Amino acid sequence: GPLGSMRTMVDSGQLTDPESARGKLLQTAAHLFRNKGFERTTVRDLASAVGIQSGSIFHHFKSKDEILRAVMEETIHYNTAMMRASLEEASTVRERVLALIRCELQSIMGGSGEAMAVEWRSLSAEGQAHVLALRDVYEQIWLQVLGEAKAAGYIRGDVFITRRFLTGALSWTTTWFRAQGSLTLEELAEEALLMVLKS
Amino acid sequence: TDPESARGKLLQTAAHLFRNKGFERTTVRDLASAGSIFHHFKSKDEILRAVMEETIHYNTAMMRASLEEASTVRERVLALIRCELQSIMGMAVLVYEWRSLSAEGQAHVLALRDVYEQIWLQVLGEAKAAGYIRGDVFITRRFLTGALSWTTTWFRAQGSLTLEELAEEALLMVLKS
């Protein structure tokens, strides 16, 4: 089950327990990097906010750049794994597309927010390398599922162009969704499905 | 307004000044040195107003012209898509200086903006009534708005994809069989 696939991520050391020592650092660092800037935040600022000695951070990260990398990778890994979980809950081709639309909207409207909005211009290149690899996996899932829909005859246009259109359509929702007031995210997801798929 | 006329030249230089520098720190001097500028406009606000208004005027007129050439509901949606993509890939001063306008300037720009979106809603409305759109008209427009504006991030990297072909792909997604 999808819960089990998430658990496997936990028992791979890929996802971090929020109430664990490492989780405390990541959670706080994300807050600090977000609403105070990465360049302004120091390692000792992180330790102070958490409530530990500045020397005990070396146990977990051994560098500030690696804290930023861990904050970004954790958030992407979680999001991607949650898309996979939602896909396992889907039963048809339409529900699989809807699963991806709904997941992306949830992140767009808040997820993780702090650890998602965060400083690419201050992350290293080797750190940029693995993050880009994670982004490729994320987009791979979109392309595969959209590819399934096209094979089933729900998409007449190009799969890659379709994803690019849908990327823009969904991200632009930050500018108008709250103003609707009564529209739920689930209703929003169904509308996006109506747009991009047939029948 | 003819872009080769004295006015057209002025709006372009002013729009360029307003973008990178900003309205506040744009001076009378650099507006007058790029001074026929005082013979065309009565105030600095009036210049900023004309910069935004004529852009919307131009975009709106181009859409109306394309709609009259279209003779099917599918050709009419495509005409709007092609026109908006053209403006997009070709308007930024507004969403980067909105405050500096007078009450009358703001009022008129919003009204122009309403007529623009009215055209979209009416054409999309036709498509839905004809059975080409299955979703809500207003939400379809908002989806299409983001889909088309996001094309600035990837279109220039495609190389072999024409903007016409891009519009056709947009049409394929937004309209039913």
Numbering used by the authors:
A (entry chain A): -4 to 113, 117 to 197
B (entry chain B): 11 to 44, 50 to 105, 111 to 197
How is this structure described in the published paper?
A novel enteric T cell superantigen, I2, and its full-length gene product pfiT, are encoded by a microbial gene associated with Crohn's disease (CD). Crystal structure of pfiT at high resolution revealed that pfiT belongs to the bacterial transcription factor family of tetracycline repressor (TetR). We show that pfiT specifically and directly interacts with class II MHC HLA-DR, and to a lesser extent HLA-DP or HLA-DQ, and show that pfiT shares an overlapping binding site on HLA-DR1 with other superantigens. We show that pfiT can stimulate the activation of both mouse splenocytes and human peripheral blood mononuclear cells (PBMCs).
